[PDB]
């Protein structure tokens, strides 16, 4: 009827996100799956608190993999922890392809839609991802009656939506036919953030720790003496500096293998090391005595 049928923006929490990465990378290249527990609010805000994982089966994600025995047993235990909730979709991984549902996954999805009408399938590709930001897309089936009569604009209302074009026409068509990709956003807490952030309990020790001293002497001689040799090469470099066009010099007489860059690198690397060394030793001496 008037039902907007606004497609799900998936607010996947920070905890859910890490768990799925972990599950998926280990199964590489076979497809891994398990279900998403959550709550659905509004008409488009599906909040995924957490996921639980299905044992990997030989079938590469299929309706068969949905086993009623495993499910009952896992859910009854989560009841005791109060961590039982509604099934708001299923995750899976295509790790050997870019994000998109094939036919087999479409049947998997179809059984999911009867279960729950706003079931999503969120494809985590966790290695081929063209961006540093893990390329993840969310899909939901859209029924053929609605598509043919071009009710598809009606499904995209109240969502800016998200652009997935890397397979051009094919990609677009597939996406539409499946469901339509929507923004994935991360709800994190500042309790969670702080935990991730600290990652070194031996900070207090290690900065007062100074390296055994036989190694410092050794290093300083190496560094000076080595720069004598890259200075000879420096001299060669500036014999030239006459060819027309800086770029032409780099091609014609093979100006790369650039002494300038190695002396600058080396000098700075050694410089900072010595700043810390003088500071640490000097601090220790006074604090402790």
């Amino acid at each position: 009827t008037g039902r907007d049928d606004t497609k799900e923006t998936v607010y996947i929490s920070s905890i859910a996100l890490l768990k799925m990465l972990k599950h998926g990378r280990a199964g590489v290249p076979m497809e891994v799956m398990g279900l998403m527990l959550g709550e659905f609010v509004d008409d488009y805000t599906v909040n995924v608190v957490d996921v639980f994982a299905m044992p990997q089966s030989g079938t590469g994600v299929s309706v068969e993999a949905v086993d009623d025995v495993f499910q009952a047993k896992m859910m009854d235990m989560l009841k005791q922890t109060g961590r039982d909730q509604m099934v708001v979709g299923w995750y899976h991984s295509h790790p050997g392809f870019g994000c998109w549902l094939s036919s087999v996954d479409v049947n998997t999805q179809k059984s999911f839609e009867q279960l729950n009408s706003r079931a999503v399938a969120v494809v985590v590709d966790p290695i081929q991802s063209v961006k540093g930001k893990v390329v993840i897309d969310a899909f939901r089936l859209i029924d053929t009656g609605a598509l043919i009569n071009n009710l598809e604009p009606r499904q995209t209302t109240s969502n800016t939506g998200l652009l997935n074009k890397a397979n051009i026409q094919a990609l677009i068509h597939g996406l539409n036919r499946h469901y339509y990709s929507l923004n994935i956003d991360y709800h994190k807490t500042a309790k969670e953030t702080k935990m991730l952030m600290n990652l070194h309990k031996e900070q207090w020790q290690s900065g007062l720790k100074m390296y055994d001293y036989e190694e410092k002497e050794e290093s300083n001689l190496a560094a000076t003496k080595s720069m004598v040799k890259i200075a000879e090469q420096y001299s060669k470099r500036i014999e030239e500096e006459k060819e027309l066009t800086e770029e032409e010099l780099k091609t014609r007489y093979v100006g790369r293998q650039d002494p300038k860059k190695h002396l600058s690198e080396t000098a700075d690397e050694t410089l900072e090391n010595n700043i810390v060394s003088v500071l640490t030793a000097g601090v220790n001496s006074v604090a402790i005595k």
């Binding site: 008037g2 609010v41 071009n150 604009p153």
Partner: protein, 394 residues
């Protein structure tokens, strides 16, 4: 030409033409086109229909004689096709009756106090959405506190759909009071509510309510930008915009450059750049200098916000400096950078002859090219369409 290229079945392609049609015929009756191309109007559905029925009131801004009569079929209680017609009818009624709206306020209120107790199906939700946009318009600037309380009950009754409308609705009614009571409730309830749309409403609402406050608004701004939520920071930006409106300020600019650089959430980055436009309409030739630097920024959001700043800023007489900033941006590949640019161009060069300056002519031609091309994506097509209708103010 716009009608022929752009098809009715798509919600978006219908919206563009319809708002733009209203603009062309704005300030006086003329539904002749609407009648000829009536089949086209009907193909709309969902929120695009809500737009179409609201567009009648754009056309009919002013006219109070036929004001109620013409919207009379479409009003709820009377036959209608759908729930959207019924909701947007109250919204269009308020446009027409705006600025003498004392009467309509009496009418529309009855429907809000009706539905505040309980709400049924979706039909009532879309009705009540439309009702709260209506009241805002009819009561604008009247700052009636008995109305403020009613609206508040729409939020607690918690149909998610009507929640967006009520939030905006408050700020339109209450403009400028900075009523200390209101500010506290709205801030607490944004945390508590989880539905995106209600929070998005109140964020803007907290900004609107402190207007003309200036240095007394100083308190509101700091707290909103300091929140973890991206949503309250989005409203945060505009707290600066509305309170310090109309007077250049050294304080106001600095806070805003800082926000646009220091915050990663991309919507907020756009919102602070927009904000600059309003504050500096006092010396409008300073706007081209302020945003010159930020237009370099490669964050796309910052860029779309740059266009809008000048749009707001130079809205009377055209300024040559402003146009140089926007000429690279008409050509940017990012789809909504272009949309804000073209839109922005029409609001500056409104009511300027094409004979006195050749550049206004060229800019009209450019819009028409985008529209014919199908190589172009729809979001530019919408941006072009909306722009022409502002220029020719119908």
């Amino acid at each position: 030409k716009s009608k022929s290229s752009l098809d009715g079945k798509f919600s978006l392609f219908h919206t563009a033409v319809s708002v733009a049609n209203g603009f062309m015929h704005a300030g006086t009756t003329d539904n002749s086109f609407i009648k000829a191309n009536l089949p086209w109007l009907g193909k709309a559905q969902n929120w695009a229909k809500f737009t179409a029925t609201a567009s009648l009131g754009v056309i009919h801004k002013g006219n109070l004689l036929e004001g109620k009569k013409v919207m009379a079929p479409y009003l709820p209680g009377s036959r209608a096709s759908s729930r959207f017609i019924k909701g947007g009818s109250l919204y269009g009624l308020g446009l027409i009756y705006a600025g003498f709206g004392r009467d309509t306020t009496d009418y529309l209120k009855n429907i809000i106090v009706e539905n505040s107790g309980t709400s049924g199906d979706e039909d009532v939700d879309v009705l009540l959405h439309g009702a709260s946009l209506g009241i805002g318009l009819a009561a604008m600037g009247s700052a009636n506190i008995e109305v403020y309380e009613a609206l508040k009950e729409v939020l607690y009754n918690d149909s998610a759909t009507s929640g967006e409308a009520a939030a905006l609705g408050m700020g339109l009614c209450m403009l400028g009071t900075g009523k200390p009571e209101a500010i506290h409730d709205m801030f607490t309830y944004s945390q508590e509510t989880q539905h995106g749309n209600i929070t998005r409403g109140l964020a803007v609402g907290l900004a609107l309510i402190n207007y003309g406050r200036q240095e007394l608004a100083d308190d509101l701004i700091t707290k909103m930008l300091a929140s973890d939520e991206s949503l309250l920071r989005y409203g945060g930006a505009f707290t600066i915009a509305l309170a310090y409106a109309g007077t250049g300020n050294n304080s106001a600019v600095k806070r805003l450059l800082h926000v646009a650089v220091s915050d990663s959430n991309d919507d907020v980055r756009r919102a602070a750049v927009i904000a600059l436009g309003f504050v500096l309409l006092r010396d409008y030739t300073t706007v081209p200098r302020i945003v010159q630097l930020l237009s370099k920024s490669h964050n796309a959001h910052v860029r779309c916000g740059t266009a809008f700043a000048l749009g707001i800023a130079c809205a009377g007489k055209g300024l040559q400096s402003a146009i140089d900033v926007l000429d690279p941006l008409t050509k940017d590949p990012v789809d909504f950078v272009r949309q804000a640019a073209m839109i922005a161009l029409s609001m500056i060069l409104i009511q300027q002859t094409e004979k006195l300056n050749p550049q206004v002519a060229d800019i009209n031609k450019n819009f028409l090219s985008v529209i014919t091309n199908k190589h172009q994506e729809g979001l530019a097509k919408f941006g072009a369409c909306v722009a022409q209708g502002i220029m020719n103010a119908g």
